[PDB]
Amino acid sequence: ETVLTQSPATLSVSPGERATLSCRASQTVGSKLAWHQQKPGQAPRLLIYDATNRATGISDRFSGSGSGTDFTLTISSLQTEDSAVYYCQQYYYWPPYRFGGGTKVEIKRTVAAPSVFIFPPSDEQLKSGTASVVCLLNNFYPREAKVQWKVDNALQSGNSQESVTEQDSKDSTYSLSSTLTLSKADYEKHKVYACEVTHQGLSSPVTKSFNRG
Amino acid sequence: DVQLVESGGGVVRPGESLRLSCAASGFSFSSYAMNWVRQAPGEGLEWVSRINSGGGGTDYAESVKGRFTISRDNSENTLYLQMNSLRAEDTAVYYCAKQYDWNSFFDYWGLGALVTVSSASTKGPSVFPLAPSSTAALGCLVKDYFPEPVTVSWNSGALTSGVHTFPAVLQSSGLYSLSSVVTVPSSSLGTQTYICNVNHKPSNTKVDKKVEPKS
Amino acid sequence: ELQVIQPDKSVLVAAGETATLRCTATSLIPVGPIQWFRGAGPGRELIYNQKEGHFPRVTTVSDLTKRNNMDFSIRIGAITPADAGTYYCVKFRKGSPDDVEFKSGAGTELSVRA
């Protein structure tokens, strides 16, 4: 099987600039390389086939180049509507139905540091028997952030889940919630609950915490 | 133009069977090889199976082998995927796809049919407050519901500016949760009304919860 | 009776070249569409069909429209290893309720040099 290395994994391009996506085959693929676009929550659509030919209907802003092993997709005048994942597909060897890893494209913006907030579990929830601690990082860029939970200054692992909003249309920032789930049993065993946040817009990491009472 | 329209999806129980169908039009269905390609929540696209023009030649990814059957009806212009012995990791959007040629790239994709596999019963959300402060932030924690989606608005849709409602996560119990948060002036707290309305159509449920500072 | 001749046994082509796969009928009765397949069984793959379908990198050598015609040769552009195999030229019969295989050529082994 031919290995298709799509690169880079994520590409940030400020609005109006050219975006240049690369796909590289382990061995020669001639001209038989095709590009697909998948915007979030829709099906894929074909952009480019035969390395260089646009499909019927496709905008002249999308173009393809290369031959052999090294290929490029170029997006001319990047709109927010081109935020999507792009996949390459070769059909020089049998079988055709494998894809590269994909390249996510997102709108580049100046760094914005997250506003951090921590929410203790509500007392109503505590009647149920399970406790959720929510940490919110608000309106930052880039998406690269580490949240670390500490319980009595002890690192937590395997009891949290993250959720990220899709990049805003307007300001191009992300928001992120991490939710710690403990039983009422283990929750009431410990005192201090902290959320620590590393992001490149902060000079040092930011900790929000509370103590039960 | 060419249309590919999938149907037959929904919620199924592990061990249930389910038939997807893809209705094809705008072209000569019998002259092309057809595929199914799936996508789990937040993953890459994963090829599932392929079928001949004539219908007698079938390939299958090893992750679905023994359990999935592809077949077709040239008379009626329809692709099928039988899926037996389903399990939780078969949860995805399944797309039908046309090939340009028998050994070529994918020409056209379907709209895609979502297939959720879960033992869990239809359940309405519990809603819990994310109490502010002690510019400020508050929200509500919409927890333990099935299936997706739930909807969320603030103060009957009267509050929109700086609201974030998060994509739902599947918890290991088989049930979904999300939070919706909103940023507002600290001056406004305990003066203004902050209610989130949480409508879950699959359970005919509306909960409205007033989120206020703790004392 | 109608016989379907493909004169070539092997055809060796370079990656990227177009290959000509040659096929001749000896009669015109029975009426019906010619079709080309790569492989022989129920796992065969449709390569071309006179009656129906768009096959974007196949051209017919002659014009198959005009009745009198008996050349069913084809050109396939941009051959790569994925195209390797054995191509049969196949006469179909009648029509109602469906087209039925009637006669097939001996087969032309297409391959690619490295």
User: Whole-angstrom Cα distance, residue B69 to residue B50?
Assistant: 10
Tally the C-alpha atoms within 13 A of residue A102's C-alpha that lie toward its C-beta.
Answer: 17
Tell whether C95 lies on the interface with B, counting CB pairs under 8 A.
no
From residue B179, how far is each of A177, B140, B202 by CA, in Å? 8, 6, 19
Kindly state the helix (H) or strand (E) to which residue A172 belongs, with its residue range: none
Coil/strand/helix, residue C96: coil
Taken in order A134, A159, A137, B168, the sign of the CA dihedral is negative
* Those residues with Cβ within 8 angstroms of residue A107's Cβ, 6 or more apart along the chain or in another chain: A12, A13, A14, A15, A78, A80, A83, A167, A172
Could you tell me the two tokens for C74?
A: 């084809």
Number of domains in chain C: 1
Domains A1-109 and A110-213 share a fold: yes
Least Cα distance to B209 among B179, B170, B184, B175 occurs for B179
Q: What is the CATH number of the domain that holds C75?
A: 2.60.40.10
Tell whether A183 lies on the interface with B, counting CB pairs under 8 A.
no
Contact A82, A105 (CB under 8 A): yes
Q: Token match 């914005």: residue?
A: A112
> CA-CA-CA-CA torsion for C86, C91, C93, C95, nearest 10 degrees?
70
Could you tell me the two tokens for B6?
A: 């999938």
* Those residues with Cβ within 8 angstroms of residue C36's Cβ, 6 or more apart along the chain or in another chain: C21, C23, C46, C47, C48, C49, C58, C74, C87, C88, C89, C90
* Those residues with Cβ within 8 angstroms of residue C103's Cβ, 6 or more apart along the chain or in another chain: C1, C2, C3, C4, C90, C91
Let me know if domain B120-215 sits in CATH 2.60.40.10.
yes
Kindly state the helix (H) or strand (E) to which residue C36 belongs, with its residue range: strand C34-38
Contact A183, A133 (CB under 8 A): no
- Beta bridge mates, C48: C36
Contact C19, C34 (CB under 8 A): no
> Cβ contact (<8 Å) for C54 and B52?
no
Least Cα distance to B143 among B131, B118, B126, B129 occurs for B126
Resolution in A: 2.5
> Cβ contact (<8 Å) for B103 and C45?
yes
- Among chain A residues, the shortest Cα distance to C15 is held by A30
Q: Token match 């390797």: residue?
A: C84
Domain spans of chain A, in order of start = 1-109, 110-213
Domain spans of chain B, in order of start = 1-119, 120-215
- Beta bridge mates, B71: B80
Say which DSSP state A187 is in: H
What is A1-109's CATH number? 2.60.40.10
Tell whether C81 lies on the interface with A, counting CB pairs under 8 A.
yes
Tell me the count of A-B CB pairs closer than 8 A.
Answer: 113
From residue A82, how far is each of A125, A163, A196, B62, B71 by CA, in Å? 41, 22, 33, 34, 36
User: Whole-angstrom Cα distance, residue B82 to residue C95?
Assistant: 30
User: At the fourth CATH level, which superfamily is domain A110-213?
Assistant: Immunoglobulins (2.60.40.10)
Tell whether B41 lies on the interface with C, counting CB pairs under 8 A.
no
Pairing outcome for strands C10-14 and C34-38: unpaired
CA distance B17 to chain A (A): 24
Kindly state the helix (H) or strand (E) to which residue A131 belongs, with its residue range: strand A130-140
Mark residue B103 as left, alpha or beta (left: phi above 0; alpha: psi -120 to 50; beta: remaining).
Answer: alpha
For residue C58, what are the domain limits?
Answer: 3-114
Could you tell me the two tokens for B59?
A: 């390939």
